[PDB]
Amino acid sequence: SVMACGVTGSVSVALHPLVILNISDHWIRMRSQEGRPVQVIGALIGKQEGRNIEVMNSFELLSHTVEEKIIIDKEYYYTKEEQFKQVFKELEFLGWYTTGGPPDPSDIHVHKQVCEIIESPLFLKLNPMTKHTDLPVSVFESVIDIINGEATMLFAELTYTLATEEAERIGVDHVARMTATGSGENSTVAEHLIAQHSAIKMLHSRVKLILEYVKASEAGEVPFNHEILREAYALCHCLPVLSTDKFKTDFYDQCNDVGLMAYLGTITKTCNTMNQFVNKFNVLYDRQ
Amino acid sequence: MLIKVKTLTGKEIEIDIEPTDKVERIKERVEEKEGIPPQQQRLIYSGKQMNDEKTAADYKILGGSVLHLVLALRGG
C-alpha cells in the first residue's frame, strides 16, 4: 500500500450489506460474457448530518483505461446526475468506490478527479479476493500530507457504525430469511407475530449484557463505578410503566371494544356454515 | 357508409365515409360541420384514440358505427 497511516479523521462513515450484492451480480454477468472478470467503479450517495456520514445508496459509473490510469467519463456522470436528483434530492454525493486488494496509485489519480465534483469526496475499497471472515470493505478519506517536504495525497482509514431505517429493515428480514410456505398458506398469526417474537429475543439479549456488567463491577474483573451503576439502578426502578387509576379503565375500554368486535365476526362465520348446512339438508331429506 | 359521431356540444352528427378513406379526412368533415379545426381534434373509436394516417377499414368501421370526439390528451 501507499498510505499516511495517520490518526482517524474528522468524519465517521457507516457500513451495512445489500449494495455489494448489486456489484457482485454485475461482476458475475460481465465475467461470463467477456471472458475475464471486469471491475466497476461507481458513485456513492447517502447523507451527512453533522460530521457523521451514513452511506445510503450507490450507483455504478462508466470508465475506461488509457495507459495504466482509469478515467471516469464526465459527460455520463452529469447526465445521470440530473436524472437521479429529480427523484432523490434529499440524498447527496459523498464520494466513490472501486474494486481491488490494498491501496494503489491508480486509486489516488482517480480520487483527484472526484475532488472536482465536491472538494472532499470519500474513497471505499472492497476486496472480493479476501481470505478473511470479517467485513472486507475498508473506508478512507484523503488527506493532503507533507512527506520529505513535498505535499502528497495520502489516504487515512475510518472505522464504522450501523444506523436507521426500519422501512428498509423489514425488507432485509425477508431478504435474509428465504423461507417457503408450508402446507397452507402461512398463518395470519404467524406472519403478524414474527417482529414481536424477535423483539422479546432482543430484550433477552439486552438484559443479559447489563446484568453481567453490574455483577462484574461487584465481583471483580470490571472495577467499581458510580456513573454506570446509578443509571442501572434507576433503570430498574421505573417498572411497572404506569399503575394509575386513570390508565386502567382506558386500557380496558379498548380491550373491551376488540372483545365485541371478535364476537360479532365469529357469529357471522357460523351463520354462513348454518346457511350452507340448511341449504344442502333441505334438498336431500326434504324436497325443499 | 354514414357514420354517427358524438360531438362536444352534446349532439350526434352523421357523415359520409368510404372505408378506404384515411381517418384524418373524417376530422375535416367534422370541422366542416362543427367548426372545430382538425388540428385540435382526437377521434376515439370505442375506447381507443383513432390514428391519423391509418385508414377507416383498418379500424373496421361500419355504417352503424359511432365515433367520440375529444380534445388532445397528454400524460404527465
Binding site: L15, H16, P17, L18, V19, I20, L21, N22, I23, S24, I28, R29, E60, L61, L62, Y76, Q83, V87, F88, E90, P136, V137, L162, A163, T164, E166, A167, E168, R169, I170, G171, V172, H174, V175, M178, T181, T188, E191, H192, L193, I194, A195, Q196, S198, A199, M202, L203, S205, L239, P240, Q254, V258, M261, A262, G265, T268, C271, N272 | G75, G76
Partner: protein, 311 residues
C-alpha cells in the same frame, strides 16, 4: 443456481419474445424472484411518497414460469390512483435510464411496473388494473407490483405481491383468498370486484455486502418502537368505516337470500355478488384479523413490561 441467476442472457429473451406464450394464458406465471436491490429501492421510494402514491419501474427477465426482477428505479410521475397509463409521462425518463444502463453493462429489458398503496393494503384499484391491461398487450412482459410502506413496519413482514390481471371478458377460476390488510369505507367496493381478476406470485431472494446490515444491526436497538404501533387509535377510523359498510352488505344478503335471484332454467355462474354470505364471512375476517392484531400489540407490552413491577 446462486451465480447462474446473476448473469442475464439476451438470447433467452429473444426466444421468449418470438414464442409469445402469454397469448394462450395470462394466469401462466407462478413464481417470482426479486432482487434484494429491487425490494429495498421499491420500499424506500414508496416511503418517500409519504402517504401519497408514487410509481417506479422494474428491469428484469422471465425464464419459464419464473419472473426475475434484477433492478428497479424510481420515476417522478403523478397519476397512480387517477390517471390511466400515467407511465407515459415517465417514458422519456425510462428511455434515458435504459440507455444509461446498457452502457455500464446492465442490458436487462423492462419486466414491469411497481407502484404503492399506502395505508390501504396491497391490491390493484380501478386505475391500476386498467393501466395493466394495456401493458399486457403492448409492453410485454409487464407485471404489476404493490407494496405498503406504513403497514409493513408494524407487522415486520414485507407485503409485496407481484400480480398479473386477466384481459377483458375472461372467466376467473376459483382462486379467491390472499393477505388481509383492511381498506377504507369507500375503497371496500373496488377491492371486491377486482380481486378475482388477478393473482399474486410467491417471492425468493439473495444477499452479500453494502445496504442490509445498517438496518439489521439497527433493529437490535430499534425493536421497542414497532411494539408501540398501538393501531387501535392510529387507524381508529378504519373500524368504524368497515363495520357500517359490512351492515349494508348484510341488508343486501337478507334480500338476496330472502327473495332469491330470479332465474328460469338458469343457475348462477361466477359473479362478485354470488353467494353473499360466503363472500361476506371473509370481509368479516379482513376486519376482525386487523382488530385482534391490534390487541396482540397491546397484549405483548402488558405481559413483558408491566408484570416485572419492582421486586
Amino acid at each position: 443456481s446462486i451465480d447462474e441467476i446473476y448473469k442475464y442472457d439476451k438470447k433467452q429473451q429473444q426466444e421468449i419474445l418470438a414464442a409469445k406464450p402469454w397469448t394462450k394464458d395470462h394466469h401462466y406465471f407462478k413464481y417470482c424472484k426479486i432482487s434484494a436491490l429491487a425490494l429495498l429501492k421499491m420500499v424506500m421510494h414508496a416511503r418517500s411518497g409519504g402517504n401519497l402514491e408514487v410509481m417506479g419501474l422494474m428491469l428484469g427477465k422471465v425464464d419459464g414460469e419464473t419472473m426475475i426482477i434484477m433492478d428497479s428505479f424510481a420515476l417522478p410521475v403523478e397519476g397512480t390512483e387517477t390517471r390511466v397509463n400515467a407511465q407515459a409521462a415517465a417514458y422519456e425518463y425510462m428511455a434515458a435510464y435504459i440507455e444509461n444502463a446498457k452502457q455500464v453493462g446492465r442490458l436487462e429489458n423492462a419486466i414491469g411496473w411497481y407502484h404503492s398503496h399506502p395505508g390501504y393494503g396491497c391490491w390493484l384499484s380501478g386505475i391500476d388494473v386498467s393501466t395493466q391491461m394495456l401493458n399486457q398487450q403492448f409492453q410485454e412482459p409487464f407485471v404489476a407490483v404493490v407494496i405498503d410502506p406504513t403497514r409493513t413496519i408494524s407487522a415486520g413482514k414485507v407485503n409485496l405481491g407481484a400480480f398479473r390481471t386477466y384481459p377483458k371478458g375472461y372467466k376467473p377460476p376459483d382462486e379467491g383468498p390472499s393477505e388481509y390488510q383492511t381498506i377504507p369505507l369507500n375503497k371496500i367496493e373496488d377491492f371486491g370486484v377486482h380481486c378475482k381478476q388477478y393473482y399474486a406470485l410467491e417471492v425468493s431472494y439473495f444477499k452479500s455486502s453494502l445496504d442490509r446490515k445498517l438496518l439489521e444491526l439497527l433493529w437490535n436497538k430499534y425493536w421497542v418502537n414497532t411494539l408501540s404501533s398501538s393501531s387501535l387509535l392510529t387507524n381508529a377510523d378504519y373500524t368504524t368505516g368497515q363495520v357500517f359498510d359490512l351492515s349494508e352488505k348484510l341488508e343486501q344478503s337478507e334480500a338476496q337470500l330472502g327473495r332469491g335471484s330470479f332465474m328460469l332454467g338458469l343457475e348462477t355462474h361466477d359473479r362478485k355478488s354470488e353467494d353473499k354470505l360466503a363472500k361476506a364471512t371473509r370481509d368479516s375476517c379482513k376486519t376482525t384479523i386487523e382488530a385482534i392484531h391490534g390487541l396482540m400489540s397491546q397484549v405483548i407490552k402488558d405481559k413483558l413490561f408491566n408484570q416485572i413491577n419492582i421486586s
